[PDB]
Amino acid sequence: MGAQVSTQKTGAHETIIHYTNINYYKDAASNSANRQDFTQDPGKFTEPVKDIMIKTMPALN
Amino acid sequence: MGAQVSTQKTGAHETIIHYTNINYYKDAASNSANRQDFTQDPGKFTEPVKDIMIKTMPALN
Amino acid sequence: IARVADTVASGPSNSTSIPALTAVETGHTSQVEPSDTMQTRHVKNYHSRSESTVENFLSRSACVYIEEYYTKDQDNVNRYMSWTINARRMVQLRRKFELFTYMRFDMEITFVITSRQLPGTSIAQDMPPLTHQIMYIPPGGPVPNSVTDFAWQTSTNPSIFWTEGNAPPRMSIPFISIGNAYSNFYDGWSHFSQNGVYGYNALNNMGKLYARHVNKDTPYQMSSTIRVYFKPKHIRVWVPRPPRLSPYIKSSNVNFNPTNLTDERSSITYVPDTIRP
Amino acid sequence: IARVADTVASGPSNSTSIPALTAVETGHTSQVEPSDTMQTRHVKNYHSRSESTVENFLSRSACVYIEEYYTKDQDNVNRYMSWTINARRMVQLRRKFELFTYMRFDMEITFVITSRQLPGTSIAQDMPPLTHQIMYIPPGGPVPNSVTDFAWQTSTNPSIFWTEGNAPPRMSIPFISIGNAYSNFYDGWSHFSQNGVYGYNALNNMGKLYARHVNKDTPYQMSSTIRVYFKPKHIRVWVPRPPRLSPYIKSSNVNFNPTNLTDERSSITYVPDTIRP
Amino acid sequence: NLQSMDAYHIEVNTGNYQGEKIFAFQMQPGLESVFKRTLMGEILNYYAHWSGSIKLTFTFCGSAMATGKLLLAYSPPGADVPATRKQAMLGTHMIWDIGLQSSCVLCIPWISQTHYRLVQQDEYTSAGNVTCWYQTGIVVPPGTPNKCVVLCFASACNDFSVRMLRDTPFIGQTALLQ
Amino acid sequence: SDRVRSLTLGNSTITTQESANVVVGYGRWPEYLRDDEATAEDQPTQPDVATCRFYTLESVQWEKNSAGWWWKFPEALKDMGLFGQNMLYHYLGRAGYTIHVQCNASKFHQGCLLVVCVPEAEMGCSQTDKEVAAMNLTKGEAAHKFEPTKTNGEHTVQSIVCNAGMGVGVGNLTIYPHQWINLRTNNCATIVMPYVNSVPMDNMFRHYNFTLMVIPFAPLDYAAQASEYVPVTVTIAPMCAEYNGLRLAYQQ
Amino acid sequence: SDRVRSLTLGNSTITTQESANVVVGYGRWPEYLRDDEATAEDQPTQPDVATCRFYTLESVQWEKNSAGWWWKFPEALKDMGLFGQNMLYHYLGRAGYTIHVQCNASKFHQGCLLVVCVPEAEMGCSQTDKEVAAMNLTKGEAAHKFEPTKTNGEHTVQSIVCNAGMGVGVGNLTIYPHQWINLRTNNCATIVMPYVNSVPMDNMFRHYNFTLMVIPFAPLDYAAQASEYVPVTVTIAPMCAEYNGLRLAYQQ
Ligand SMILES: CCCCCCCCCCCC(=O)O
Ligand SMILES: CCCCCCCCCCCC(=O)O
């Protein structure tokens, strides 16, 4: 089938950890949640300044 | 098996979106609806004229 | 795939091109678009007519019939159901099917059977789960005259045995019509002398459907209501037509009462003022 | 993958580097870390922000509504349910959604329907399993005015038929909004004259949801309580905002009563002594 | 006229009628009583969402000797309905000149904030109005009618589309038919 | 068939089934000001479709005794949508304009109008000893009309047609961009006027770049029972509208 | 020196010698609507320099007991030059905006303001049982002010500062595009807001895209003989202004 093997979340016996998935429905809205999308970009809220500010330097000068 | 992978309808997280299907019954009447047949030809009802009419021109002349 | 047309960017104009001018007398529907009668900007239209498909439009279970049958043999209550299959007794689905003159498709039939115990002063029971039997009888087959008729043997007629509590019974059927397509409208007669039956009933004959309780008898009177649902799939439709305007009166013909073309209003120039700061 | 930043080993310092000094006036949030203001050791941090994901945060079924409807037609008890879909009547889920201004996602809807028999002196029955019907009516569709209205034919409106005992009915729905994203806050009006409806209700319109017992009638009065659950999936959120501080008063607007910024305490220098040998 | 062919008739007369509004209506393909029942609107009522442009074709049914110029205007939501020709003329309009070509199309462009609109249009998803006026007037020779009929046609464009399947509110019953 | 024509500017479109070609100013077509001809250093604003669209003015009635009419632009469009708004807020302006005069009758009516665009149509006063008042030269979209006889007004314009209120012969106005509306063949007249002035730009309230005159040379006539109401509507659309010198709106 | 900065939009220019960088919305900079995101088919109008310029609103006085102020856009600019004219004549609008709040004192004065831009700043009513009136939400370039105590008005906004009239904590407003004006280091605050909405465009009278709030966290203070008049002026300039749906001006 259109099987798609992904990686499972670390277990309590770490340091065959993968699962299989197949969509049965025609609408993408039927698929399960995307609990594995780990994107980040705090810059939008933490550093929305026009002029890049270097940590080790004075904010104003 | 006789699996057949198709494309799913766009989801609310666009811009692995495919599903698998296998028929289990011997009669085609048992299969699911054909919700993905997008054919069109309005000409039958909107332009059933014998002489092609060019938009940018006079209907009668 | 089933995407909609985009709008080409148009600019000023001043030529002998007359896309706005035409003549409906030809029976031709103008193929003009905004860009032909004004300055438009380019627009990548991603909209899709995927849900306008005749398949997606008609492929949805809709109730087509409903009858009630009792368990005990008291009074003149019917203990079994009988029905001359057709979708002309439920205005909703009937109106959709009638948007087209001819139809061809397979169909998914689902049954929603529910029971109850009729009111009473002393009705303490303990009846086991009620099992029902739905039997389809194609034109000509023997019809049962009782809840114990030999016809319920279902020797060759398709039949379903369902017990309450479980998921509503279902099953698909192909394209039965003896013609190349089902006919929603038949402007003709059943007899060559131009008389007898007129319209649908003149040719359509999908047979009958019977139901009953397979349980012998109940201490106190109980009744069940079966609801038949139709869901056409693998659809094909021909010759579209004006939607039903007048309410449906009979389920055997198209009789109607002179109905208004639409709702009324003050005058041709009436437009409600919705802006009042 | 969604791992956290490690701490670089830092040693003594004595330069013109001023990572600790800054100016919040710029609207810039200091990007300082322990290693910048002290001597730190190397630490391979394996922690992950996998559960802080907007997906994992909002993708959890939360109750959004609850109503009760009876079986028998006694007194002025509603025999069916009606509901103008929205998630502003349950503070819990409503507060989460309101952490962001705009949202976009598909959704998994689950229904928890439970029934009961109202108290009485003589209520000995034997009612078969109760079957329910939940019908969604998008804006404009015909609304039923009784438990026997023609609207329940569900000709094209999505509907579910569930019998007690089985797993709670469920079904997914895409992104309905006619806009590019659901709006939790609308600082505007419904009319151009800047009047009429203000806020959410001014534009959101997900339609209505109706429920009922498909069973004809019960010997003695019984009632059922339906609980609707929402679980957004394939989530997208924009413009974060200050969490709700004041309790929710109305489900149509953001009205509130002047609430305290936080709990009080003795003085700014108050810290409970927890060490008393 | 709810049961006569006059319901479709849009009269136009000879003589001074400046400042007079020939007709007007809202742009609710599925809610407006004017469109509510047309093939187009009749279908929209099986859906809750709609989008795209609309083609309003006008046909002059007067005599071959009658002449005239009409101003077909369309004003997007936001302001009051055009009370004068000047106000209407400020919006998307089409000056139709009656001649050999009987019909004239007034394509109402899709100028909405949102991608889609509700068939059960409310003030939020307002579409605007359409008002018709006399650009000049209808001049006619001796021995010729002074009143003429102007038919109106409505249909969707190649950029039109519905979206939310629902049941039509134009059909119901109180019991199984027989 | 060159009889039918269509015009599209902005959100406006005009239709015709009985036109007579299109006169294009002095052979030139409206164009924005080039850098090697500009003077105003500030970057101009170009509303485009916002101001460059068809504006219809108050219709006028053509009678068996009508002597003529005249409009002055861009003044006449001071209250027309955004085109008029830019005139108020800006010191300098520049536009093209597409004049389209409509007037239909029937194969049984007769008459002939002269649609002309006169650049710098400086007019004279009724009383040669006095001066004229702006109020008598141009009054918004309201048209001033020529008289078949001499006028007497204090500060009125010498409306006597034969001299076109300029002290010249009306039969020579054909030297300006024009067209005729001979009812037996026409139905309208279109003229595309390019920006004509001795300066790259100019104020639009203080200066009346050109005057549109509609003078009938063939008296309107017809038989009994024949529509007596024959209106003449004027529609004009700015082209390549540029504006400079943005400041507080001018109080009319 | 990053202290000094200059802003130029249209025929307007702002100067500063004591700024603190520039906050750019949510990392985005104003941009015109793309074809793959547009809905309105008609070609939009872009006045550019005509509407995209610095508009100064009525100044406000900062007092030792001032609790705050707030403005709602684009509504607040309904009567500002041509930007307001396009709002009247058009059904749809879209703009960026460059907020620049000025406020100078001296090395002897003290105080700290919080300049913030709150998208969809839906506000509550004084009487939780009633509704609010547009007149109490935004009143042109006239600023509404927050109160240090609870309000009682019938259809008034709950001006009590601590809740910012939104039922939230004022200390958390820092999650929105903002800057502070700490007199001992600042002199002004600039914020470039990109078009933020769940729709490509929207009406500019019916919808208040965002609210500008200036709330002081450090009370204005000073000694005797020290200028007691400390005004706070707000200047804003639209960016990438687009308009659709041209029609008859809307009567306010
Ligand atoms: C086993 C059950 C068989 C039921 C047959 C139903 C056939 C439906 C045909 C509908 C014809 C029509 O709608 O014109
Ligand atoms: C078939 C049931 C359909 C129910 C539609 C629910 C839509 C929920 C939308 C929530 C909008 C919001 O929270 O801003």
Tab-separated table of C-alpha atoms in Angstrom, chain G:
chain	number	residue	atom	x	y	z
G	1	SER	CA	25.355	56.568	16.087
G	2	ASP	CA	22.166	54.511	15.804
G	3	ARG	CA	20.465	57.094	18.023
G	4	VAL	CA	19.754	59.400	15.093
G	5	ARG	CA	17.378	58.235	12.370
G	6	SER	CA	15.414	59.707	9.475
G	7	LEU	CA	12.093	58.637	7.956
G	8	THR	CA	10.889	59.665	4.501
G	9	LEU	CA	7.481	58.827	3.042
G	10	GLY	CA	5.924	60.921	0.306
G	11	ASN	CA	6.378	64.647	0.889
G	12	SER	CA	6.927	64.101	4.611
G	13	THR	CA	10.092	63.514	6.629
G	14	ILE	CA	10.593	62.845	10.329
G	15	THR	CA	13.805	63.431	12.261
G	16	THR	CA	15.086	61.924	15.501
G	17	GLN	CA	18.257	62.217	17.548
G	18	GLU	CA	17.199	59.914	20.373
G	19	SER	CA	15.430	56.823	19.060
G	20	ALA	CA	15.826	53.161	19.996
G	21	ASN	CA	16.018	51.186	16.754
G	22	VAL	CA	12.818	50.410	14.836
G	23	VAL	CA	10.368	47.586	15.488
G	24	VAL	CA	9.126	45.955	12.297
G	25	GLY	CA	5.743	44.363	12.926
G	26	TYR	CA	5.972	40.597	13.233
G	27	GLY	CA	9.253	40.548	11.361
G	28	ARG	CA	7.428	41.550	8.189
G	29	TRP	CA	7.522	44.753	6.176
G	30	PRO	CA	4.493	46.254	4.346
G	31	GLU	CA	3.934	44.844	0.849
G	32	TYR	CA	1.287	45.058	-1.874
G	33	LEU	CA	-1.142	42.162	-2.320
G	34	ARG	CA	0.196	39.415	-4.601
G	35	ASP	CA	-1.779	37.830	-7.444
G	36	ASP	CA	-1.758	34.406	-5.786
G	37	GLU	CA	-3.446	35.883	-2.706
G	38	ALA	CA	-5.840	38.390	-4.262
G	39	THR	CA	-9.621	37.971	-4.421
G	40	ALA	CA	-10.958	41.255	-5.803
G	41	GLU	CA	-10.775	40.905	-9.587
G	42	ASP	CA	-10.939	44.633	-10.357
G	43	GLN	CA	-7.592	46.373	-10.791
G	44	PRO	CA	-6.733	48.152	-7.516
G	45	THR	CA	-5.663	51.783	-7.256
G	46	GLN	CA	-2.393	52.761	-5.603
G	47	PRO	CA	-2.222	56.529	-4.881
G	48	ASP	CA	1.262	55.895	-3.501
G	49	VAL	CA	2.809	59.183	-2.323
G	50	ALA	CA	-0.686	60.689	-2.274
G	51	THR	CA	-1.850	58.570	0.666
G	52	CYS	CA	1.367	56.958	1.883
G	53	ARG	CA	2.746	59.889	3.871
G	54	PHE	CA	3.060	60.990	7.506
G	55	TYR	CA	-0.201	62.139	9.087
G	56	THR	CA	0.085	63.868	12.465
G	57	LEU	CA	-2.865	63.505	14.849
G	58	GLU	CA	-4.010	65.798	17.666
G	59	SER	CA	-1.322	65.936	20.349
G	60	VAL	CA	-2.061	64.750	23.883
G	61	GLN	CA	-0.829	65.998	27.252
G	62	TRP	CA	1.014	63.652	29.594
G	63	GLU	CA	0.236	64.458	33.227
G	64	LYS	CA	1.424	63.023	36.540
G	65	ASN	CA	-1.988	61.350	36.774
G	66	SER	CA	-2.421	60.279	33.140
G	67	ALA	CA	-3.487	56.645	32.805
G	68	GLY	CA	-3.094	56.193	29.058
G	69	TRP	CA	-4.594	56.745	25.607
G	70	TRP	CA	-5.618	54.761	22.527
G	71	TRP	CA	-6.410	55.238	18.836
G	72	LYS	CA	-8.074	52.934	16.312
G	73	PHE	CA	-6.969	52.680	12.685
G	74	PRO	CA	-7.565	53.110	9.854
G	75	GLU	CA	-10.704	54.772	11.251
G	76	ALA	CA	-8.700	57.492	13.027
G	77	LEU	CA	-7.445	58.633	9.610
G	78	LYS	CA	-10.865	58.977	7.968
G	79	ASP	CA	-10.395	62.736	7.575
G	80	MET	CA	-6.698	62.731	6.676
G	81	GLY	CA	-6.045	64.110	3.200
G	82	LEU	CA	-6.443	61.694	0.301
G	83	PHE	CA	-5.986	58.613	2.472
G	84	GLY	CA	-9.381	59.372	3.959
G	85	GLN	CA	-10.873	60.133	0.556
G	86	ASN	CA	-9.999	56.681	-0.754
G	87	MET	CA	-11.633	55.144	2.318
G	88	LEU	CA	-14.896	56.869	1.413
G	89	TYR	CA	-14.939	56.027	-2.297
G	90	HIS	CA	-13.700	52.443	-1.933
G	91	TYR	CA	-15.256	49.303	-0.485
G	92	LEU	CA	-11.949	47.535	0.168
G	93	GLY	CA	-8.629	48.789	1.494
G	94	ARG	CA	-5.188	47.550	2.532
G	95	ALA	CA	-2.274	49.440	4.101
G	96	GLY	CA	0.914	49.097	6.119
G	97	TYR	CA	1.422	52.093	8.431
G	98	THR	CA	4.526	53.416	10.176
G	99	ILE	CA	3.622	54.502	13.700
G	100	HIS	CA	5.889	57.193	15.138
G	101	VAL	CA	5.091	58.430	18.643
G	102	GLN	CA	6.982	61.535	19.765
G	103	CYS	CA	7.494	62.728	23.338
G	104	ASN	CA	10.463	64.717	24.621
G	105	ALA	CA	11.246	66.059	28.094
G	106	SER	CA	14.652	66.592	29.707
G	107	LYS	CA	17.391	64.845	31.675
G	108	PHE	CA	15.536	66.121	34.740
G	109	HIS	CA	12.130	64.626	33.933
G	110	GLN	CA	11.215	60.960	34.294
G	111	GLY	CA	8.575	58.577	33.016
G	112	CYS	CA	8.097	55.591	30.740
G	113	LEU	CA	5.414	55.037	28.110
G	114	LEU	CA	4.426	51.835	26.330
G	115	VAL	CA	3.704	52.311	22.626
G	116	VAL	CA	1.872	49.216	21.378
G	117	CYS	CA	-0.072	48.125	18.296
G	118	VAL	CA	-2.822	45.654	19.149
G	119	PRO	CA	-4.363	43.808	16.166
G	120	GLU	CA	-8.110	43.190	16.531
G	121	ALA	CA	-8.183	45.030	19.859
G	122	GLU	CA	-11.791	44.071	20.597
G	123	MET	CA	-12.734	45.995	23.750
G	124	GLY	CA	-15.302	45.451	26.490
G	125	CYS	CA	-18.107	47.616	27.868
G	126	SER	CA	-18.238	49.444	31.207
G	127	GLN	CA	-21.573	47.812	32.002
G	128	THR	CA	-20.977	44.128	31.272
G	129	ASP	CA	-24.724	43.760	30.728
G	130	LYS	CA	-24.811	46.228	27.832
G	131	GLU	CA	-22.932	46.809	24.574
G	132	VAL	CA	-20.464	49.445	23.368
G	133	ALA	CA	-20.984	52.209	20.806
G	134	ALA	CA	-18.586	52.925	17.935
G	135	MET	CA	-18.523	56.510	19.204
G	136	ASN	CA	-16.895	55.222	22.397
G	137	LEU	CA	-14.429	52.933	20.617
G	138	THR	CA	-12.889	55.450	18.231
G	139	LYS	CA	-13.604	59.125	17.554
G	140	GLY	CA	-11.472	60.283	14.638
G	141	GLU	CA	-8.028	61.692	15.407
G	142	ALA	CA	-9.370	62.457	18.884
G	143	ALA	CA	-7.817	60.040	21.369
G	144	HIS	CA	-9.749	58.076	23.979
G	145	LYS	CA	-8.006	57.770	27.333
G	146	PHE	CA	-7.649	55.049	29.946
G	147	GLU	CA	-8.696	55.727	33.532
G	148	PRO	CA	-6.848	54.702	36.722
G	149	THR	CA	-10.213	53.511	38.054
G	150	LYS	CA	-13.328	51.659	36.879
G	151	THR	CA	-15.766	53.325	34.481
G	152	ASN	CA	-19.575	53.315	34.624
G	153	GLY	CA	-20.773	54.600	31.256
G	154	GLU	CA	-23.805	52.986	29.632
G	155	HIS	CA	-22.096	52.052	26.371
G	156	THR	CA	-18.624	53.228	27.369
G	157	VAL	CA	-15.440	51.159	27.199
G	158	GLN	CA	-14.035	49.778	30.459
G	159	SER	CA	-11.184	52.308	30.499
G	160	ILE	CA	-9.612	50.858	33.650
G	161	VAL	CA	-5.939	50.618	32.642
G	162	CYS	CA	-4.889	47.462	34.514
G	163	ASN	CA	-7.087	45.475	32.102
G	164	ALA	CA	-6.379	47.585	29.003
G	165	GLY	CA	-10.103	47.425	28.287
G	166	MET	CA	-9.694	43.876	26.995
G	167	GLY	CA	-9.902	41.826	30.179
G	168	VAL	CA	-6.190	41.034	30.215
G	169	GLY	CA	-3.001	42.073	31.988
G	170	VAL	CA	-1.330	45.267	30.785
G	171	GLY	CA	2.064	43.783	31.584
G	172	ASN	CA	1.521	41.229	28.827
G	173	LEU	CA	0.864	43.714	26.018
G	174	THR	CA	4.564	43.351	25.209
G	175	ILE	CA	3.551	40.390	23.049
G	176	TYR	CA	2.426	42.882	20.399
G	177	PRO	CA	4.658	45.052	18.180
G	178	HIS	CA	5.871	47.678	20.638
G	179	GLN	CA	8.525	49.994	22.036
G	180	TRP	CA	8.930	52.042	25.197
G	181	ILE	CA	9.662	55.737	25.609
G	182	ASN	CA	11.873	55.917	28.678
G	183	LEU	CA	12.514	59.668	28.832
G	184	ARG	CA	15.980	59.128	30.321
G	185	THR	CA	17.043	57.307	27.146
G	186	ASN	CA	14.302	57.805	24.557
G	187	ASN	CA	12.542	60.643	22.789
G	188	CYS	CA	10.197	58.702	20.508
G	189	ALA	CA	9.087	55.271	19.288
G	190	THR	CA	8.618	53.872	15.781
G	191	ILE	CA	6.766	50.727	14.735
G	192	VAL	CA	6.329	49.475	11.180
G	193	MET	CA	3.104	47.470	11.116
G	194	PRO	CA	2.458	45.108	8.190
G	195	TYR	CA	-1.104	44.428	7.033
G	196	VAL	CA	-2.403	41.946	9.611
G	197	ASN	CA	-5.822	40.384	9.032
G	198	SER	CA	-7.472	37.043	8.229
G	199	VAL	CA	-8.457	38.458	4.840
G	200	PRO	CA	-6.502	39.935	1.871
G	201	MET	CA	-8.443	43.192	2.217
G	202	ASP	CA	-11.331	44.626	4.223
G	203	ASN	CA	-13.513	47.696	4.723
G	204	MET	CA	-11.771	50.550	6.535
G	205	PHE	CA	-14.797	52.071	8.287
G	206	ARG	CA	-16.501	48.902	9.489
G	207	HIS	CA	-13.281	47.231	10.662
G	208	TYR	CA	-10.628	48.595	13.040
G	209	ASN	CA	-7.585	46.549	12.021
G	210	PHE	CA	-5.455	47.559	15.009
G	211	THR	CA	-5.399	49.789	18.081
G	212	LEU	CA	-2.489	51.990	19.138
G	213	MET	CA	-2.176	52.202	22.918
G	214	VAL	CA	0.183	54.489	24.837
G	215	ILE	CA	0.186	53.387	28.479
G	216	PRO	CA	2.662	54.893	30.988
G	217	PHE	CA	4.231	52.411	33.419
G	218	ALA	CA	6.477	55.031	34.997
G	219	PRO	CA	4.463	58.106	36.102
G	220	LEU	CA	5.632	61.417	34.660
G	221	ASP	CA	7.437	63.372	37.362
G	222	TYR	CA	9.737	66.349	37.886
G	223	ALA	CA	10.801	69.074	40.316
G	224	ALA	CA	9.621	72.667	40.686
G	225	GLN	CA	10.170	75.154	37.856
G	226	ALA	CA	10.545	72.208	35.478
G	227	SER	CA	8.332	72.391	32.379
G	228	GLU	CA	5.019	70.866	33.443
G	229	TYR	CA	3.724	70.601	29.885
G	230	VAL	CA	4.852	67.321	28.328
G	231	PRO	CA	2.831	66.554	25.162
G	232	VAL	CA	2.739	63.228	23.320
G	233	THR	CA	2.215	63.476	19.562
G	234	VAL	CA	1.330	60.554	17.303
G	235	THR	CA	2.283	60.422	13.626
G	236	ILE	CA	1.373	57.582	11.267
G	237	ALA	CA	1.993	56.956	7.566
G	238	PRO	CA	0.179	54.339	5.427
G	239	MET	CA	2.328	51.946	3.385
G	240	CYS	CA	1.483	50.065	0.188
G	241	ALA	CA	-2.053	51.456	0.225
G	242	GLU	CA	-4.338	49.558	-2.164
G	243	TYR	CA	-8.033	50.130	-2.832
G	244	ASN	CA	-10.814	48.171	-4.538
G	245	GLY	CA	-14.522	48.570	-5.188
G	246	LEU	CA	-14.850	52.166	-6.354
G	247	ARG	CA	-18.305	53.672	-5.845
G	248	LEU	CA	-20.163	56.716	-4.489
G	249	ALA	CA	-18.487	58.177	-1.395
G	250	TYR	CA	-19.799	56.920	1.946
G	251	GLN	CA	-21.734	59.465	4.012
G	252	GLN	CA	-20.220	59.483	7.501
